[PDB]
Every structure is written in structure tokens, then in C-alpha cells.
Ligand binder design. Structure first.
Ligand SMILES: N#Cc1cc(=O)[nH]c(=O)n1[C@@H]1O[C@H](COP(=O)(O)O)[C@@H](O)[C@H]1O
Ligand SMILES: O=c1ccn([C@@H]2O[C@H](COP(=O)(O)O)[C@@H](O)[C@H]2O)c(=O)[nH]1
Lengths: 257, 257
């Protein structure tokens, strides 16, 4: 039987970051993650403040910000605390353990100092998670493993996907779930987040493929939709965010019965 | 038929960045890529200057440099031109095509502006290559696809590796080779660069595994060794680089005939 997000937040083996997230999802009736794919810090902060009420999570690509500073991220954290959403840096860590630990903690971005969640590809083997967790565990962070991808020709299928699930299971002190197109774990402590989402059928010209919130949440059993252009390119981004939220939220409620 | 690096530089289908690399490998008698895994720009540049005559390539992780600026990269380019080596940013692009184009061109790092070579994981499908190529083509840049990894539990094996080789063949206008543990293509226009290399047997505590230059170049048929800690951890990095250079170069001479 399916548990509500609020009940899942209380599960004995739940990660604190997953619990925080699940509680605010239930409080705000949102399972929408905004993909804030913009080049200017002011745009990032403007979207975060305006859409924050409607979202459970803000997904960043800090490496495309033409004017990144750590003060930008300080300010984003204030907004995250005010409007109640988590910050997920979509870094796709994909190197050996010794390297990713440095990429997570250090450099100019100091990602671990501000991102509640990061994600990682499983292709290097479990050392990618071991390296990240050496930085993330002390800082009370969580990680998502990329079990499937939305893009045309994705190799994250079959035995690769099963490997991602095993890796998460064996590293549950740090891994809180998956980037995937569908439910891949039967354990309710894990979150499923799905990108490649728009209301209308389509794709882009560089291999992105879309499915609807009803399909991904309702039929495929994912928890959270990740939506970028579907919202950001709309004339009215507030109304678009609300349309996606309502869609994902109702799909969840229906599945839950 | 085994061709020298100088001959391979003249192959009909050779990419101009591969040709430039192969020419300087032959001229300088080096098939050593230094993995400059340091956190300080001064150490990076001092290594680049001192070891430049010994290396064909300097591999960077600019996202670990605590004091990155574009002015640091300008000085690195100056050293690369002076000593004759290529700059390879080991970014491991691994996102959908629309995202990686921005991560390559933009942000604070503006990687395409200074890196001769970058690499990409093949897990997203060929969109990853199509996105990078939109940026790299007019700038006369090249890309390496990660066909195999050196780390314990790597999923880059079997059909995954074969998919990487097919993707390289189909995008030979931009893809100039592979990150691999051995020769994965029989086409001599492709470069093979191999990380996980040390003179001594062993590994690290986070999944790295090492093989020797003689094994990797000599028996496994790779072209270039990528060496980080085996050089960086030495008291005298120049002497260490010279050790690796001579090992790798003589291994190469042996399979030539
Ligand atoms: N290239 C690459 C990459 C992929 C791979 O499969 N194995 C690696 O070690 N690397 C990188 O090569 C370097 C290996 O360094 P070391 O020789 O283990 O100190 C690192 O910068 C690591 O991030
Ligand atoms: O498998 C994946 C993994 C990540 N993303 C990311 O999610 C967002 C998709 O945005 P859009 O296609 O909704 O604009 C982008 O930031 C992209 O990098 C995907 O689309 N698919």
C-alpha cells in the first residue's frame, strides 16, 4: 500500500533531507521541482522568489551562471528557507571518488556548502558515492543517483539501472533516491525525481524527450516532476508553475487513492 | 600496421587538434598527459612551466581550483604555446545536449574558450556530443568520449564501451578519441588516453586502480598515459614526470617494431 508524502517523512529509515522535503511537499501540496536554467544570478533569484511558494525544490546548474558568487548562493538559501524549498545542484558528479570529493566541497562553487541535494552518475562505480559521502555526511546532505535519463539514446537502462538501485540501497545514509523516469525502487524511503516533463507531447532538437505529469507521477509512480522550459519559456511563469504543480499534485493524490 | 605518432598526424581523416597533438608528441618524444590535480593556481602554473617540456598535454579540473580566473587560464595558454602541449579540461560532460552546450561555452569557466580538449560520458546518448559540437566546431576544439573507466565497479564495459566507440565514429568531426583502459577502436585516427597509471602496483582508498605505463601503452595498446598522484605526490615532480615520460615513450617505441 502507498503511503502519503507526510507518512513517508516519518519512516524509521528515512534520511533527514528526504524527511524535510517530504514534509514541505505535504504542507505546500507541491511535488514540483523548478529547473532554473538561466545564465544570470538576478534571474535565478527572481524566479526562486516568485515561484518559491509553488515548488518543493529548486534545481540549479551553477556552472551556467555567468555571474556566480557565493553571495548569490547565500541569498538563494535565504529564499529557500523563507518559501520552504530545497536546493538541488544538478552537477551529475561522474568521476572517481577521490576527484568528486574535491569537486563537491571545493573550487569556486563550494557546492556542498549550499546544496541540500546533489546527483551523481553511477558509471564510475560506488566510489563516486563513497567520495561524495565523505563531504556530504558531515554537512547533513543528500544525494540522488541517476538511474535513468530522459534523453534519446540513454544507456541508463537494464542492468545499469539495477546497479544504481543496488548502489543507493547500500549507501542509504547518504543516497536519498533517484533521478529516473519511473519508480525503480520499491522502498518508500527513496525519492524518485523525473525530468523530461511537459504538459504537451514533444522533445527538443538535442535529444530531450517529454512525458506529462500524469504519465510520470500517476502511471510511472514517480514522486516529483522536474520542469524547466515548460515553465521558464511560458509568458506567465507563475501560472505555468501552478499548472504543473496542480497536475503533479493531483496525479499523486489519485495514485494514493 | 602500427604507425608512429608523426605519421598518424598526417592521416587523411585526422582531426586538426589530434594532428597538432600527434606532431608535438613526436617532436618532444612524449606521450605523457599530466593530471594537474591541484587546488592552487600558482601550483598549477608552476607545474605547467616546469613540466611543460616533458608532457604532450596538461589535464585540468578547473572546478577544483580555489582561485580560478580567466587570467589564470590565459597564463596557462601562454605556457601551453611556449612549451607545446594541449590543454584538456576533464569536465566529463554528462547531461542532455541542451544543457552541456551552456556548460561548455558559458558560466564563469567558459571552458570552450581555453580548452583544446574536453571529455564526455556517453550515458546520455549522442545528444551530449551534438550539444558540445555546436560550440566546439567553429572554435576548432575536440572531444574525448569515456569508453572505459579505471575505477572499481565501473559500469563502462561491454555494450556500453561498444556504444562509446560507435558514437565516436559517427561524430569524427569533433570526437578525436577516447578515455579508455586499452585500445577500443582499430581506427588509427583516434587517440586513446588512459588514466589509472602509476609505476607501482596499487590503488587508492576510493576505488582508483593503477596499471603501469608498460602495461597500458605496451600490452593494452593505448597512446597516452594520464598521471596525477604518481607525479604530483612526488617530492620532485619534474624528475617524476621524466620517469613517466620515458616509461611511456619506450613502451610506445616497442610496439612500433
Ligand atoms: N581521465 C579520467 C578520469 C577517468 C578515469 O576513468 N579515471 C581517472 O582517474 N580519471 C581522472 O584522471 C586522474 C587520475 O589521477 P591519479 O593518477 O589517480 O591521481 C584524476 O584527475 C581523475 O579524475
Ligand atoms: O535525465 C535527465 C537529467 C537531467 N535533466 C535536466 O533537467 C532539466 C530539463 O529541463 P527542460 O527540458 O524541462 O527545460 C535540465 O536542466 C537538464 O539538464 C534532464 O532533462 N534529463
Amino acid at each position: 500500500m502507498e503511503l502519503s508524502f507526510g507518512a513517508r517523512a516519518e519512516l524509521p529509515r528515512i534520511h533527514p533531507v528526504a524527511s524535510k522535503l517530504l514534509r514541505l511537499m505535504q504542507k505546500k501540496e507541491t511535488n514540483l521541482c523548478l529547473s532554473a536554467d538561466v545564465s544570470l544570478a538576478r534571474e535565478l533569484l527572481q524566479l526562486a522568489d516568485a515561484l518559491g511558494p509553488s515548488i518543493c525544490m529548486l534545481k540549479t546548474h551553477v556552472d551556467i551562471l555567468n555571474d556566480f558568487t557565493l553571495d548569490v548562493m547565500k541569498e538563494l538559501i535565504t529564499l529557500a528557507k523563507c518559501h520552504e524549498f530545497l536546493i538541488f545542484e544538478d552537477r551529475k558528479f561522474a568521476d572517481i571518488g577521490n576527484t568528486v570529493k574535491k569537486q563537491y566541497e571545493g573550487g569556486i562553487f563550494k557546492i556542498a556548502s549550499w546544496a541540500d541535494l546533489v546527483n551523481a552518475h553511477v558509471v564510475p562505480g560506488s566510489g563516486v558515492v563513497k567520495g561524495l559521502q565523505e563531504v556530504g555526511l558531515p554537512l547533513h546532505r543528500g544525494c540522488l543517483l541517476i538511474a535513468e535519463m530522459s534523453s534519446t539514446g540513454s544507456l541508463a537502462t537494464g542492468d545499469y539501472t539495477r546497479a544504481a538501485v543496488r548502489m543507493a540501497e547500500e549507501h542509504s545514509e547518504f543516497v536519498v533516491g533517484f533521478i529516473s523516469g519511473s519508480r525503480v525502487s520499491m522502498k518508500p524511503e527513496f525519492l524518485h525525481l523525473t525530468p523530461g516533463v511537459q504538459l504537451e507531447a514533444g522533445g527538443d532538437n538535442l535529444g530531450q524527450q517529454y512525458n506529462s505529469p500524469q504519465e510520470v507521477i500517476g502511471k510511472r509512480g514517480s514522486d516529483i516532476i522536474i520542469v524547466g522550459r515548460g515553465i521558464i519559456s511560458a509568458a506567465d511563469r507563475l501560472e505555468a508553475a501552478e499548472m504543473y504543480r496542480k497536475a503533479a499534485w493531483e496525479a499523486y493524490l489519485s495514485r494514493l487513492g
